[PDB]
Design a binder for this molecule. Sequence first.
Ligand SMILES: COC(=O)C(=O)n1ccc2c(Cl)cccc21
Ligand SMILES: *[C@@H]1O[C@H](CO)[C@@H](O)[C@H](O)[C@H]1NC(C)=O
Length: 349
Amino acid sequence: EDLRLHLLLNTSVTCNDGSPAGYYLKESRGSRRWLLFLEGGWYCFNRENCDSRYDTMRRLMSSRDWPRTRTGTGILSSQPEENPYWWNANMVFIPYCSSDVWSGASSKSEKNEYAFMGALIIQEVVRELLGRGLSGAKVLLLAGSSAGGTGVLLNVDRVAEQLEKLGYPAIQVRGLADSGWFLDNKQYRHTCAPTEAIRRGIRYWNGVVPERCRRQFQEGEEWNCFFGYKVYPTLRSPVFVVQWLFDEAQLTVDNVHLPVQEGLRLYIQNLGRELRHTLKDVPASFAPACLSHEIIIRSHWTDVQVKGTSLPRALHCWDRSLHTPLKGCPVHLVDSCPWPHCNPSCPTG
Ligand SMILES: COC(=O)C(=O)n1ccc2c(Cl)cccc21
Ligand SMILES: *[C@@H]1O[C@H](CO)[C@@H](O)[C@H](O)[C@H]1NC(C)=O
């Protein structure tokens, strides 16, 4: 139970229900690497579905019942056996309690039953960490899984700009977006689809998107910036993208529920090809042909390989690339085989 809870000293930066947001921290003295991980866990986009989430997913909306410690797992583990990549880093787990894909900047008030402060939670965690050693960092890796991976894409440049404005231009801000790279495609069977939900959420949350992406799609169309293949080209920070080709959350929002017949076989194969296409020009990426969801904080995240390279190895190669491609140390790893578990190293379930 190595990461210790700190509730935000600025108690106006809150979870959905107005309780203080926070972060779990395990410091590594003398490491200048900082890993800030954004938890995932879907979202809610109106009073009714947020009220339901408050009843049976309350830890995702409130800090009142958070434990005082959490154990770092996967990329948040401090044991080299479990985390070959960054076991010696300063470790931060930021609980997802804003239900807004880390995009919101609205307080709970007279007019708002819930606060949606995800974007501000990230800025406040960064601000308070500077006094706990982040000021001496050389790399800040903003990582995240599922809604947290989309949160990385939405916030990594804002963290870089925040540190630049606060007078810390030496800190290299980077992003690692795990299972947050979704397609606004056709559902397999046509209730709120992966487009309308984000459209409603933005209004309900007062959600904010990266500025260059906002300037392309403009008012009313900022929902576009929640989609990795649209927002990624606008980003300036280096971002490593981890995405299963047949992501279970993607299939869920596509109304696919797994003897597969022709129509569904073609649908699933087309989905993998489309995902693979959107990553063709993403130089740092890890995209195995598996039916799964999330990876980087799983204890067995070291097991999966693409073309014989594990994700911890790919991330280490990425680190080296950010010191021409490296001999035997690849960073672009996208499966080409066209069906779930055509990669033998896929998670077993
Ligand atoms: C469980 O997965 C999530 O919680 C999540 O973040 N998402 C699920 C669909 C989706 C889309 Cl379509 C765009 C951006 C984020 C999305
Ligand atoms: C607390 O956070 C709010 C919202 O981000 C901000 O407006 C305010 O300046 C902060 N206050 C302090 C004392 O940091």
